């Protein structure tokens, strides 16, 4: 959301059925 406020990041893997490596939410656009 911008370093100027927060330092928490939400990574996003591109195209995988969710078995790669919490709250892992599956989209049509990736895990």
């Amino acid at each position: 959301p911008g370093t100027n406020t927060s330092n928490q990041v939400a990574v996003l893997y591109q195209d995988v059925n969710c078995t790669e490596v919490s709250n892992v939410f599956q989209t049509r656009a990736g895990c």
Binding site: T3, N7, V9, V11
Partner: protein, 241 residues
Amino acid sequence: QLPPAYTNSFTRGVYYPDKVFRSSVLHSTQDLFLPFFSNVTWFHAIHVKRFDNPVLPFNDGVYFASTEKSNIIRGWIFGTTLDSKTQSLLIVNNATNVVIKVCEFQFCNDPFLGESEFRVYSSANNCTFEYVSQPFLMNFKNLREFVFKNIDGYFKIYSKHTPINLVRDLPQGFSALEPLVDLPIGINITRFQTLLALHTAGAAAYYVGYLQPRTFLLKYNENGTITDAVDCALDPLSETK
């Protein structure tokens, strides 16, 4: 002699990789470093014959958080396998200067200096160099952040001494690390051990960390000093940066 406990670094171990001065250049590079927040082996001499340097693997780069206030630490030694025949490294910060000798050192069951106990070489059959260096005579203030990189016929030692204010795991601060001496020696080294000046059990807890290849983003200030650095392998945000 209590066991060494894991403790983590904090933005420690940033040294000028070369001599090329630059100004306000947010510049990336790749080299061996101490990764941030890495579990450095706290050798606890604050535990309340701790010459406790069982001959420690000199991996390719070793952070040495020298924690001392009165030169209770004498120096170090560096060798390959310590077989009483190979040519090793003697590192004593003597009261005349830093005395370095690479020599046909004869590792006894206790190769170290003191200078009274000198079971390092009984004979200098091949004493390929003697180094009477520049004059340097030796809470933990002078946190002599010594880093030992040895590669390419070069034994390189970057360093900086300045009285820090803490007596425990390294403070939540940040500072550069000047280069001090590169010596064109080129001998085999696998493992080492320090030379704490023997009084001894003592109390001066000195940390020892390991290095390995990484890539950083330094930040040279307009004056021309490393004002901040960023790991590129710590957290996704760090890769974003």
